[PDB]
């Protein structure tokens, strides 16, 4: 394990990941401006943050 030195818990399980639920300066996620993804998250109620 030390030879490869792989850090787990880096892949995101999906939109339901707790780290994705809350904002943080260490993790940056974004989309393309003025697209369908922008209006999907804007219209959603739970995904306000």
């Amino acid at each position: 394990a030390f030879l490869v030195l792989d850090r787990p818990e880096e892949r995101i399980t999906g939109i339901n990941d707790p780290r994705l639920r809350n904002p943080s300066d260490k993790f940056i996620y974004a989309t393309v401006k003025q697209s369908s993804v922008d209006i999907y998250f804007r219209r959603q109620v739970e995904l306000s943050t």
Partner: protein
């Protein structure tokens, strides 16, 4: 009937924020609340 309700801002139970700069009114899943 119409009845007034008091409220205090604390924890996820009540979070107060200013009006939406984009829509101009209360956002989704949000209700207005006055303050003196």
């Amino acid at each position: 009937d119409h009845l007034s309700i008091v409220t205090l801002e604390e924890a996820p139970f009540v979070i107060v924020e200013s009006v939406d700069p984009l829509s101009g009114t209360c956002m989704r899943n949000t209700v207005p609340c006055q303050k003196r």
